[PDB]
Design a protein around this ligand. Structure first.
Ligand SMILES: CO[C@H]1C/C=C/c2nc(co2)-c2nc(co2)-c2nc(co2)[C@@H](C)CC(=O)CCC[C@H](O)CC(=O)O[C@@H](C[C@H](OC)[C@@H](C)CCC(=O)[C@@H](C)[C@@H](OC(C)=O)[C@H](C)/C=C/N(C)CO)[C@@H]1C
Ligand SMILES: Nc1ncnc2c1ncn2[C@@H]1O[C@H](COP(=O)(O)OP(=O)(O)OP(=O)(O)O)[C@@H](O)[C@H]1O
Ligand SMILES: [Ca+2]
Length: 357
């Protein structure tokens, strides 16, 4: 059985190729003693009072390799309960991942974990595959980074990839700030977990932000309430949609960047004029931060406004899209026709880490 590990900024998704969903989903966090050994994931969070917690992946890119090794170790031995030397392992990477980073991942998998075979695929490409397509443009938005990735005949078009370092954690941070200003202090890690929950449960993307603001200003009809751990009930109205509006208006958190509708359109415009029609008709949303109710309808509206008036526009937002990258990997790695595409330990021992390219 092959393994699929999809390492994100916020969450690890791991499991077995052929399965419908990752068996293990846990925070991409490593904790080491504050005062001198390590813990990963939920247990690191539980023992946070005695540990320094770190995220080895920053906006989709591995930046702490020693801690990343702990993530992988924990994934194999504690979460999946397998011996990595017994299983071909498919890993994922961010769009525009540096060549040296892909080489380091490869070296670690073979030399440290002794996997018999491995493969590294681009996250957004796997999401496209999970939707049954080989041509389309993916918007992948997680906890740490958002990318637009146009793909033609199975391959990403790297020149046309767009990146926004604005994603779920920034949205949680903004909601924390908003609620703190209203007099409900959310600052600590325990408090961040509460606000992340409020965000996931109550936030949504307005179809027309101005109209929605007017509605919230003139009626209680958009209000929702939420009981905090201390027993206070907080009610939110316009916070529900102001928070994810930041994706379309990055200026809400002081960023001068284009919003996700603009990055989508700009990405399509970088592509060959002769494939744009196919991209417009095959916009696939991937990742946890695309889960907001209303986001597909809003994107449809915004892309329609930017594109030629005769252009057929379609946004595809699969219900399973928290796990689309992982599912794409599960499909690819279990595919009878992919079995000759693995990099084997033998090939690695002959040629070294650069074989991965
Ligand atoms: C109809 O054809 C397909 C047959 C499916 C084979 C297969 N499917 C699986 C394992 O093998 C599998 N499905 C799951 C896990 O493993 C799975 N499904 C689910 C969850 O897990 C659902 C909840 C959601 C889904 O239904 C997913 C849709 C999948 C679609 O069939 C993929 C496809 O077109 O693959 C096809 C290939 C992909 O095409 C988009 C792609 C991976 C090909 C790319 C290349 O070969 C390089 C360009 C595939 C050939
Ligand atoms: N229902 C939801 N509504 C809004 N946000 C959600 C929802 N469910 C999950 N999220 C957010 O999705 C993010 C996690 O998604 P995902 O696993 O795709 O990211 P990742 O792979 O860890 O990060 P990245 O891809 O940025 O490196 C978190 O910010 C989480 O709060
Ligand atoms: Ca991801």
């Amino acid at each position: 059985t092959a393994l699929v590990c999809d390492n994100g900024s916020g969450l690890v998704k791991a499991g077995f190729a052929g399965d419908d969903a990752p068996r293990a989903v846990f925070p991409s966090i490593v904790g080491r003693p504050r005062h001198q050994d390590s813990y990963v994931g939920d247990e690191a969070q539980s023992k946070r009072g005695i540990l320094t917690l770190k995220y080895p992946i920053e906006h989709g890119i591995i930046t702490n390799w020693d801690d990343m090794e702990k993530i992988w170790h924990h994934t194999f031995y504690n979460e999946l309960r397998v011996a990595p030397e017994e299983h071909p392992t498919l890993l994922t990477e961010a769009p525009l991942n540096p060549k040296a980073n892909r080489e380091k991942m490869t070296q670690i998998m073979f030399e440290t974990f002794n996997v018999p075979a491995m493969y590294v695929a681009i996250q957004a490409v796997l999401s496209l595959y999970a939707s049954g397509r080989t041509t389309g443009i993916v918007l992948d938005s997680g906890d740490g980074v958002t990318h637009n990735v146009p793909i033609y005949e199975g391959y990403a078009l790297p020149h046309a990839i767009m990146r926004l370092d604005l994603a779920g954690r920034d949205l949680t941070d903004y909601l924390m700030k908003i609620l703190t200003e209203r007099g409900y202090s959310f600052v600590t890690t325990a408090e961040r977990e509460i606000v992340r929950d409020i965000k996931e449960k109550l936030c949504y993307v307005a179809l027309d932000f101005e109209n929605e603001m007017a509605t919230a200003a003139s009626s209680s009809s958009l209000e929702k309430s939420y009981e905090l751990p201390d027993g206070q009930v907080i009610t939110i109205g316009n916070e529900r949609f102001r928070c994810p509006e930041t994706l379309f208006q990055p200026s809400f958190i002081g960023m001068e960047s284009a919003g996700i509708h603009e990055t989508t359109y700009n990405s399509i415009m970088k592509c060959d004029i002769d494939i744009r029609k196919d991209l417009y008709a095959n916009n696939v949303m991937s990742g946890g931060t695309t889960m907001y109710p209303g986001i597909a309808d809003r994107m449809q509206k915004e892309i329609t406004a930017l594109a030629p008036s005769t252009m057929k526009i379609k946004i595809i937002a699969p219900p399973e899209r928290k796990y689309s990258v992982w599912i794409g990997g599960s499909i690819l790695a279990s595919l009878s026709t992919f079995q000759q595409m693995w990099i084997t330990k033998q090939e690695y021992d002959e040629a070294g880490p650069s074989i991965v390219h």
